[PDB]
């Protein structure tokens, strides 16, 4: 996400600011020269950024470099990446609700017969 959003046109050689954690991604091959400020960067992501040839800052260094945040790109990770959000919303067993149910295990015998089949009574 960091590379995509920094390689978007117009926002060249700016500083990307994250108030979260910057994490290494393994299915990426080429890392551009990036300029990063974050609360913490994982060890392998730090190694990748430095070996590519960028710089990593802390927030005090960011405040010294640009007190007003001028020339910065403010990003954040996917807030709805957590698995709990697949359980929220319209309750299951209700028409047009693709909400994951709470089941102890996934399998043939676990909550698949009565409300889910058309042959076993009804399908919502």
């Amino acid at each position: 996400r960091m590379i995509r959003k920094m390689k978007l046109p117009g926002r060249e050689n700016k500083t990307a600011v994250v108030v979260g954690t910057v994490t290494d991604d393994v299915r990426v091959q080429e890392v551009p020269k990036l300029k990063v400020c974050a609360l913490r960067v994982t060890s392998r992501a730090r190694s990748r950024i430095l070996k590519a040839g960028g710089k990593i800052l802390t927030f005090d260094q960011l405040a010294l470099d640009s007190p007003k945040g001028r020339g910065t790109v403010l990003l954040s990770g996917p807030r709805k990446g957590r698995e709990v959000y697949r359980h929220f919303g319209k309750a299951p067993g209700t028409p047009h609700s693709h909400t994951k149910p709470y089941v102890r295990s996934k399998g043939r015998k676990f909550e698949r017969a009565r409300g889910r089949r058309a042959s076993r009574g009804y399908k919502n």
């Binding site: 359980h87 309750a91 709470y102 089941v103 102890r104």
Partner: protein, 210 residues
């Protein structure tokens, strides 16, 4: 009574479970006792390997683990008679033996024979009457150097053959792995019925031709 969205559970606590509750407060004491008995046995068997007899190379049984080797029960009688050691002498000199193990291929048999030969070249034998040496017995130069080793005698470690880069040939480039797998599956599934149909077809053939 269920309340709102939850996951309905099945606790197996309907028996008299509080009567049988095995606590682990004596775990550190058990560890100390095990380690003390281990040291006692090791010091009792003075020069012999502390981890007992040597054990052979073994492939794990099922498809899930059949790519890994490990240590088995004992060497097999075919391996002993190919290595040259006697059934009743192997245990005396410190080699694990079991008469249950079969040998379905030559590779495992040869690997275990080579392992036995290495161990036999490796051990040092003492004269059971020190004032009188014997034929196959070692000399004082190594009798002085004999010492126990920790851990397993000859550790069983799985290694991977080193495979170097190659230029890809056009036959390899043009092979269809997915198609080959699908046709293999279909042939294995249809073999018996195809043989049957050919049988009855030849039956009508001979009926018309006789």
């Amino acid at each position: 009574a269920p309340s709102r969205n939850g996951m309905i559970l099945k606790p197996h606590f309907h028996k008299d479970w509080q009567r049988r509750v095995a606590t682990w407060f004596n775990q550190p004491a058990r560890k100390i006792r095990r380690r003390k008995a281990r040291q006692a046995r090791a010091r009792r068997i003075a020069p012999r390997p502390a981890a007992g007899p040597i054990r052979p190379i073994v492939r794990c049984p099922t498809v899930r683990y059949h790519t890994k080797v490990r240590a088995g029960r004992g060497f097999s009688l075919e391996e002993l008679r190919v290595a040259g050691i006697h059934k009743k002498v192997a245990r005396t000199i410190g080699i694990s033996v079991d008469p249950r193990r079969r040998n379905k291929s030559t590779e495992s048999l040869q690997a275990n024979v080579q392992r036995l030969k290495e161990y036999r070249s490796k051990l040092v034998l003492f004269p059971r009457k020190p004032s009188a040496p014997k034929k196959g017995d070692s000399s004082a130069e190594e009798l002085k150097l004999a010492t126990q080793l920790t851990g397993p005698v000859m550790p069983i470690r799985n290694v991977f053959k080193k495979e170097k880069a190659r230029v890809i040939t056009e036959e390899e480039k043009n092979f269809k792995a997915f198609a080959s797998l699908r046709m293999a599956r279909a042939n294995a599934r249809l073999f018996g019925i195809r043989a049957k149909r050919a049988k009855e077809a030849a039956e009508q053939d001979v009926e018309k031709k006789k």
